[PDB]
What we know:
The protein is mainly alpha-helical. It has one domain: Orthogonal Bundle (Lysozyme), CATH 1.10.530.10. It has helices at residues 5-14, 25-36, 89-99, 109-114, and strands at 43-45, 51-53, 58-59. Helix 1 packs across helix 2. The longest helix is centred in the first third of the chain and has 12 residues, at 25-36. It starts with a helix and ends in a 15-residue tail after the last helix. This is Lysozyme C. InterPro entries: Glyco_hydro_22, Glyco_hydro_22_CS, Glyco_hydro_22_lys, Lysozyme-like_dom_sf.
Amino acid sequence: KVFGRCELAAAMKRHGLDNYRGYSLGNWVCAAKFESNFNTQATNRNTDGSTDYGILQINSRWWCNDGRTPGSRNLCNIPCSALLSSDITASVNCAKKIVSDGNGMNAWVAWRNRCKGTDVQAWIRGCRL
Length: 129
């Protein structure tokens, strides 16, 4: 599935991301935008053998198990394939664990590069939330 900006915003709200660990909804939408372009199916292969999965490009070395990643930790306790659903639940559940880990949203490179310090509220303006 490719989410629309406002559709995603509403899903993320319903899943309790608004202000989670001090990050307003706009942060999350912004991250999704630069990470996956709002695509639930996005995958990216890395030099270390790991793959980033789904709308929040969650990495197979630390977070989910794809069975082909050396040094896997599976800290979210999920198969990576569950991160490619049309339903964002799994991804949100894992993301809540990631952000609670100590580096906040610095875990998302695209967030750090492109969202942090900007008017992230732009991402939710025009939406019926």
